[PDB]
Design a protein around this ligand. Sequence first.
Ligand code: AKG
Ligand code: AKG
Ligand code: PRO
Ligand code: PRO
Ligand code: FE
Ligand code: FE
Lengths: 268, 267
Amino acid sequence: QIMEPHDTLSPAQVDEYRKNGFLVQEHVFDEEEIELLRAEAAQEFASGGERVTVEQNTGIVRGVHGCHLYSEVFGRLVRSPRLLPIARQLLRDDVYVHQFKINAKRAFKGEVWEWHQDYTFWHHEDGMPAPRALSAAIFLDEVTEFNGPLTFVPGGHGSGMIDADVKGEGWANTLTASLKYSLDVETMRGLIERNGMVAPKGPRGSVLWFDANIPHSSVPNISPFDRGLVLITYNSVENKTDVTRGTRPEWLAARDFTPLTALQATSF
Amino acid sequence: QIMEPHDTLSPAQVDEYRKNGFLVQEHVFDEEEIELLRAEAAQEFASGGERVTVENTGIVRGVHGCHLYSEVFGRLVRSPRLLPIARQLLRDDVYVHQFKINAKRAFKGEVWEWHQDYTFWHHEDGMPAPRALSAAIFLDEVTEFNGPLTFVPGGHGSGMIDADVKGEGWANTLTASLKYSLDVETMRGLIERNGMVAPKGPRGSVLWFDANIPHSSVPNISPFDRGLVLITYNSVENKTDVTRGTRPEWLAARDFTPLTALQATSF
Ligand SMILES: O=C(O)CCC(=O)C(=O)O
Ligand SMILES: O=C(O)CCC(=O)C(=O)O
Ligand code: PRO
Ligand code: PRO
Ligand SMILES: [Fe+3]
Ligand SMILES: [Fe+3]
């Protein structure tokens, strides 16, 4: 009977997150915790059925989606006192999970993620009315320069949504190497020319926080080292999506907007 | 379909609260909001029955647990002007341990003896630690002369202090003459070290104060009322040991469900 008092971000941390559109906290989770998250990720890849995506070239696991609805471990993770208080502080509201994914980015054969803003998809596919949302990516493996790290244009969220060409009809291609919305090179080259690019690194158990509208990308992982990320997308409850205008299953775009509460210490 | 984003306290404000044991935010609620709360309060005094306390004169002095009976007060404790700060200060999800409205009528009012709230919540209710706080909403301007709450700044920083226990039961936990009151010598000591302060402010302000800060107040000699809505928030982790509890739910809550903030609806 005692969890550690909720920790929130410093005012400088908050500033950095607002100016850059991302922020890394190192070693939020320890090794044993990361090993539990890894074992549960594996179970979900094995048993997720239609919720699992596979790589085009190899048929190797690319993603598993909506796990917090199906796994007791992931349903508790999203309420962790290491995460929830910060989601609530950054979004200045009570929050809920809009989306939960584990992106495997396997060694050697892990494929690209093209440049995009997340809000673009959540707005047009799910009816998210404003970009008042964020993601927390938990590193199940050390992130280096060589294993296809998640990459951002810092400050690139200052513009809001950005002209992306749509491509195709339903939603299967929202999770693929070739993405339904994506930035056109010209659009990108200029962002990059103006703002640069940054790929934050960190050890296992770090959490990378980022804005719903920051442009980001990742190159193929041809290295020998996996780069497993657990991505939790937190949305402001006031900003709940309009389910009238929603097109995807629950396991991609949540419908239950109950405010999350933090996990308390129990004897089990 | 918009509430104002949750506001929290600055690092300065938070530091000021921890060192002094209290903090005023001026003008949280407007005159119109305050009036709706004043009218609901009057309803509660009128219909509260056994939950209502009276002063010499039988003038209603207090009513308790209104958040459980009034929809307005049930909503107020979830307000985005209140709940986010209670969570920030207690560093937890929170729930309401106690809710009370204390009237201190113009030319009327009694002397509340020096006391620490946590002394009652620990011994009567089973609150295991002082990880709790109270938010006092000013229904009227609080001045020098209408019996303001008065504190010893930093007085919370030692423990719960040893106190005279008079009476058995809980009737005298709500009375001018309190069940646990602070010894004369012990207070003198505290006051000679720390001094005394009565925070002031306009109507609609909120006075946050620690569960263990010593406080007192005197009768009101102004021709103006001093209504306080006092909401006591407790950390969920700090929930009270219900097996050691002695008082009803309208004084000491037993439903520990984390509060969630109030959202915009069309009604
Ligand atoms: O795993 C990655 O590098 C990118 C994932 C991402 O941005 C997403 O799935 O939206
Ligand atoms: O309203 C007052 O002046 C006294 C409040 C108080 O300290 C209490 O009811 O515990
Ligand atoms: O479709 C989605 O919502 C996620 C986020 C952008 C790419 N895949
Ligand atoms: O009994 C109670 O809980 C309140 C707090 C101290 C005075 N009366
Ligand atoms: Fe993305
Ligand atoms: Fe008191």
